[PDB]
Design a protein around this ligand. Structure first.
Ligand SMILES: *[C@@H]1O[C@H](CO)[C@@H](O)[C@H](O)[C@H]1NC(C)=O
Ligand SMILES: *[C@@H]1O[C@H](CO)[C@@H](O)[C@H](O)[C@H]1NC(C)=O
Lengths: 142, 109, 119, 49
């Protein structure tokens, strides 16, 4: 997984949210974004994990909000097996405000699938006050 | 146009004298924006009234104005040799942005 | 401080067209809320409003002279150009270019130029 | 302005009342009647603003 980009009309005439988590930035940008049918970032030589085609939003109209924050604890390169790490997020929408809660647990003892039966909490990551309707967003892994 | 103004007014120096510009209430509308300019010969006119009984910076307190039902009256106190000029009325209108006032020349002796 | 200056030919043949310029110096016309207009006064009679243009490229002409006059602005050289057509001996007049505001209709007037029609 | 100002816009037609604190705007064509509407507006098609 890389980052979540989302608007409403996919044409850079209506404002939209840009969340990018490539290597060290976490950039949040409220600006119009022209979206596509199939914007892709993972595709790279089919074996090399790179954010190829970083530019999936072609154009913009008027940018208002900008916020920079630290990245998370991920791994490097691409390989299959021994999926120790677990992440869990919850996204909520209250009166325009958009709140995200996150939790990351490493070295999960249980096998693939086999949802862990251990109690866990979620600390408040961040709220963002955009003030639009949200029923259409999608993650863009790389 | 449809707007008029008496041209000549006479008086005596040291006293007060008034002139008026008159038209139709419908064309000028409810909102007045009465304005008055002065023009002595051989250089461009300037503004002496821009709002109802109002005068901008560079004041001459002898000036006065008053907006009646369909007229705007300009009154001068303590006349001196500078009155012998032509004074123009100017008000916003509805159907067009016209004023088209003849202006008022002043006489004294 | 602002000076309004008028420039153009004084004698014009009636079949020929007329051009006039006003080289305002002392305000940036691009400021939001300020316009500039043209007023003519034929000798022997009252004045006569011609047209006016706004800061943001909005143009208002006289009710009769829409085709006769055309206006344009150049804030780089701080000038305004006006074109008048098929003029008449009655149209001969003294012309002024003037700053325009909403509360104060017209505040500062240029000195003006005489225009007469003959051969 | 003396000649009037026309650069200000306001929405008239929407399919439903919007939730509090909505900012985004869409300039797509609106159809009042049940007749399908595309391209240009007209009968039963009113411009949203
Ligand atoms: C994160 O974004 C900043 C801002 O554009 C950029 O300078 C930086 O290189 C990015 N980090 C990457 C590409 O790893
Ligand atoms: C890797 O991807 C780049 C960009 O898509 C492409 O130019 C290059 O030919 C690819 N190389 C291989 C070996 O697939």
């Amino acid at each position: 997984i890389r980052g979540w980009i989302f608007g409403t009309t996919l044409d850079s005439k209506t404002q939209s949210l840009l969340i990018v988590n490539n290597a060290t930035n976490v950039v949040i940008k409220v600006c119009e974004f022209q979206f596509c049918n199939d914007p892709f970032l993972d595709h790279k030589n089919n074996k090399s994990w790179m954010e190829s085609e970083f530019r999936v939003y072609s154009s913009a109209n008027n940018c208002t909000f900008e916020y920079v924050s630290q990245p998370f604890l991920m791994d490097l390169e691409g390989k299959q097996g021994n999926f120790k790490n677990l992440r869990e997020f919850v996204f909520k929408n209250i009166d325009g405000y958009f709140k995200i809660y996150s939790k990351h647990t490493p070295i999960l003892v249980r096998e693939p699938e086999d949802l862990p039966q251990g109690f866990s909490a979620l600390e408040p990551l961040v709220d963002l006050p955009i003030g639009i309707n949200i029923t259409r967003f999608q993650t863009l892994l790389a | 146009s449809a707007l008029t103004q008496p041209a000549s007014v006479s008086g005596s120096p040291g006293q007060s004298i008034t002139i008026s510009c008159t038209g139709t209430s419908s064309d000028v509308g409810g909102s007045n924006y009465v304005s008055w300019y002065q023009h002595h010969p051989d250089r461009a006119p300037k503004l002496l009234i821009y709002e109802v009984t109002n005068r901008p910076s560079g004041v001459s307190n002898r000036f006065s104005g008053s907006k009646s039902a369909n007229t705007a009256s300009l009154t001068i106190s303590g006349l001196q040799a500078e009155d012998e000029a032509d004074y123009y009325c100017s008000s916003y209108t509805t159907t067009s942005t016209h004023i088209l006032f003849g202006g008022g020349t002043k006489l004294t002796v | 401080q602002i000076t309004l200056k008028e420039s153009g030919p004084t004698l014009v043949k009636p079949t020929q067209t007329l051009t006039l310029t006003c080289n305002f110096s002392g305000f940036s016309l691009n400021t939001y809320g300020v316009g500039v207009g043209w007023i003519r006064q034929p000798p022997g009679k009252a004045l006569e409003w011609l047209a006016l243009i706004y800061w943001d490229g909005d143009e208002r002409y006289g009710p009769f002279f829409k085709n006769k006059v055309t206006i344009a602005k150049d804030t780089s050289k701080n000038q305004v150009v006006l074109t008048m057509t098929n003029m008449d001996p009655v149209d001969t007049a003294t012309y002024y270019c003037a700053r325009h505001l909403i509360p104060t209709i017209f505040d500062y007037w240029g000195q003006g130029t005489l225009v007469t029609v003959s051969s | 302005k003396v000649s009037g100002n026309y650069n200000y816009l306001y929405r008239l037609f929407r399919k439903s009342n919007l939730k509090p604190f909505e900012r985004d705007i869409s300039t797509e064509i609106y159809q009042a009647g049940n007749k399908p509407c595309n391209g240009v507006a007209g009968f039963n098609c009113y411009f949203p603003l």
